[PDB]
């Protein structure tokens, strides 16, 4: 049962070698050995082993998954003091709250961004309203203004939400599941703008992840909407790109979904005090984030001090800025309803199969059912 050591689980696509290095430092001033592993589908495996009082002491995963884990009582409640709390961006603490209780620490933040071709576009548009006009100017040269994944709501939400949409009303570490914002005027304004893009041929209704990505990378389109995971692909492409704040819509900022990497302690661990000490005083320090980051970049981080160092790269700063304006993803189980419903509403409104008013009225209905 572990007991006198620390076992940590983190995905293979993360800086687990850097995390193993923070661990060697911990083992130095403590004698406690830390063990880092990155098992396959660990987020699937966690719930299974933890339900039987097994698994790692600590688990790293995006915050959204923590809601389901917490529901089943798999995570220990955390109690950083005020002082520790002030070391991180306030908005990040909202991501790791499960019905008022703090159930994890936030490490890393990723958010969608406006990516643009500096050779085709001098200055990115500040507004969504000016894209149509820009597209007609670019079309004059055989280029298009923007191409992004229209198929998944994760990608279209920034625009839909801009003027007032939200998944679930949040107001106290708690989500009101009967306060859904997919059918308001806000969301209606947004989806309508999107639909108008497609019918006015500034955008194709069948643009997916692959298509927009290839298009941007081939220098065929001036802009794209993507996240930090896409950067390595653009580099390769040799496109002279920039990352910036998403455009505003109706004078209001876009409200993209933000994913926040978070780390939690197994409710079944006998080592919670060791975990909290490792996490608060070794890992969540400039030197801890740095050793990890050196192994594999974290993107924007929750620790204010280190983020300020990282922000010298404009891309991550832009992502952070978007994140701050962004909407904390619901952790809640009802979020599954939202994905399917809103997915359907958009493809339907986009393909003419249903009107905007209709498409959203329906989705609203299936979520609050």
UniProtKB/TrEMBL annotation:
Q: How does it assemble?
A: The complex is composed of two ATP-binding proteins (MalK), two transmembrane proteins (MalG and MalF) and a solute-binding protein (MalE).
Keyword Signal appears in the UniProt entry: yes
Q: Where in the cell is it found?
A: Periplasm
Q: Name one Pfam family in it.
A: SBP_bac_1
> What Gene3D superfamilies is this protein classified in?
Periplasmic binding protein-like II
The role this protein plays is: Part of the ABC transporter complex MalEFGK involved in maltose/maltodextrin import. Binds maltose and higher maltodextrins.
Q: Which domain of life is it from?
A: Bacteria
Instruction: Name one cellular component (GO) term.
Output: outer membrane-bounded periplasmic space
What name has this protein been given in UniProt? Maltodextrin-binding protein
Keyword Transport present in the record's keywords: the answer is: yes
The UniProt similarity line reads: Belongs to the bacterial solute-binding protein 1 family.
What species does this protein belong to? Escherichia coli
Q: Which UniProt keywords apply?
A: Periplasm, Signal, Sugar transport, Transport
């Amino acid at each position: 049962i572990e007991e006198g050591k620390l076992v940590i689980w983190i995905n293979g696509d993360k800086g687990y070698n850097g995390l193993a290095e923070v661990g060697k430092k911990f083992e130095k001033d403590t004698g406690i050995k830390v063990t880092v592993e990155h098992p396959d589908k660990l987020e699937e495996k966690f719930p299974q082993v933890a339900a039987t009082g097994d698994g790692p002491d600590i688990i790293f995963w995006a915050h959204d998954r923590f809601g389901g884990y917490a529901q089943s009582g798999l995570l220990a409640e955390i109690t950083p003091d005020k002082a520790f709390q002030d070391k991180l961006y306030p908005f990040t603490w909202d991501a790791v709250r499960y019905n008022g209780k703090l159930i994890a620490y936030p490490i890393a933040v990723e958010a969608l961004s406006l990516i643009y071709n500096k050779d085709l576009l001098p200055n990115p548009p500040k507004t969504w309203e000016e894209i149509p006009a820009l597209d007609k100017e670019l079309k004059a040269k055989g280029k298009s203004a923007l191409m992004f994944n229209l198929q998944e709501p994760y990608f279209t939400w920034p625009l839909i939400a801009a003027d007032g949409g939200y998944a679930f009303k949040y107001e106290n570490g708690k989500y009101d599941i009967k306060d859904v914002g997919v059918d308001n005027a806000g969301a209606k304004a947004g989806l309508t703008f999107l639909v108008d893009l497609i019918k006015n041929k500034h955008m194709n209704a069948d643009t997916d992840y692959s298509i927009a990505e290839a298009a941007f990378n081939k220098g065929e389109t001036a802009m794209t909407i993507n996240g930090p995971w896409a950067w390595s692909n653009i580099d390769t492409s040799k496109v002279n790109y920039g990352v910036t704040v998403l455009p505003t819509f109706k004078g209001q900022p876009s409200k993209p979904f933000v994913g926040v990497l978070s780390a939690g302690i197994n409710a079944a661990s006998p080592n919670k005090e060791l975990a909290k000490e490792f996490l608060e005083n070794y890992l969540l320090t400039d030197e801890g984030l740095e050793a990890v980051n050196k192994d594999k970049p974290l993107g924007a981080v929750a620790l204010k001090s280190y983020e300020e160092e990282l922000a010298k790269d404009p891309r991550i700063a832009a992502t952070m800025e978007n994140a701050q304006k962004g909407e904390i993803m619901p952790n809640i189980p009802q979020m599954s309803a939202f994905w399917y419903a809103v997915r359907t509403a958009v493809i339907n409104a986009a393909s003419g199969r249903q009107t905007v008013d209709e498409a959203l009225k329906d989705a609203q209905t299936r979520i609050t059912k």
